[PDB]
Amino acid sequence: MDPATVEQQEHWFEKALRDKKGFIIKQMKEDGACLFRAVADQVYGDQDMHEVVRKHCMDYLMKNADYFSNYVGNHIEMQAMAEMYNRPVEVYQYSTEPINTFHGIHQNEDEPIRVSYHRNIHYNSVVNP
Template identity: 55%
Template sequence: MRFARALKEKKGFVIKAVQEDGACLFRAVSDQVFGDEEMHATVRQNCMDYIVKNADFFRSYITEDFDHYVNRKRRQNCHGNHIEMIALSELYNRPIEVYEYSIEPINIVHGMYKTDNEPIRLSYHCGVHYNSIIDPWRPTAGHGLGLPDLQPGRAQESLIRTALRQSEESHIERAMLDDKIAATDWEATQDQLIQQVARESYLQWLCDSNQQHKDNKMMPSSSSSPTSATTHERTANSNHGSSPRNLLPLRLDERKDCEFALPFNYECDPSSKPSMSSY
């Protein structure tokens, strides 16, 4: 809708649609005053009660029987008009601005007293329906209710602060959780690296030990010939050098078992012995 788009771009206002059931005027005013269009029955009752209390003033603006008019307007599906707007403006001490396909109000209803309260803004469509016009940056709910300490928007600001605090706490908790997950992943990675290094070191040690064992097995076989030869030579030399000494036993008890390699031998026959007289 071009009207709604122009109103938002030029004024920053937003048209808030209300239900089309004959109570649209009271619904739109209820949204402006109470922040909830469902309070329209209360708004209607207060409006008609105010007209009755000020019958001398409003009677001159009503062309039909006053009591019949009031009873008809009390019905929930009966439309409101400019007489109810005057009563509502005076009742809540807020001017009422009516916008109809323009960014400037076509009608402004003032009450009996001057006020600094924000006006009640209404949009008028097709000559039969009212909607609520709100300023998102300046809440007006509560204005005109006779509450001297009321500051419209305080509750909303409190909700915003609470939402911001909860969002910050949630963000901090999420950041802490992400840091914990990252730290856990880092520790797990470190453990895996340490295990891998230890495994590779152990495998390398096994390979080195196996190779050293194989080398130790091959060394005796390759050097056995020179060693045995040297040992044989030493043994031969030892036997050769000690053989003259072993021909005659040094001990007397060993001599009886030895045979002397002499050019003669002893015989027990006396006749075979040479005679001394022959010499």
């Protein structure tokens, strides 16, 4: 996709999500920590907590290494975070409904962590004002 077509896709998605669902795509810094940034914004309201989220995700995986060693979209990290925060994680992909949902412990289904996954492996935070 040409840079102009890419920007058209991004703009269409932001508008559709705002108009159809009332959600806002909050831009996270575009580094390799963007998944943890988006979750940090969802949980703490502040992407600066990204390294703490990552630390806690890694702590959770290590603690549960017997289970997670079965398995070694960021599926492993997303399951860990949904379980650890006891909230589902909903992943939007140029979509106004989630493409998939990590259920966590199947509690707090009305308060999901919502993230959007974009071109070039980037995640943003999907906020319900």
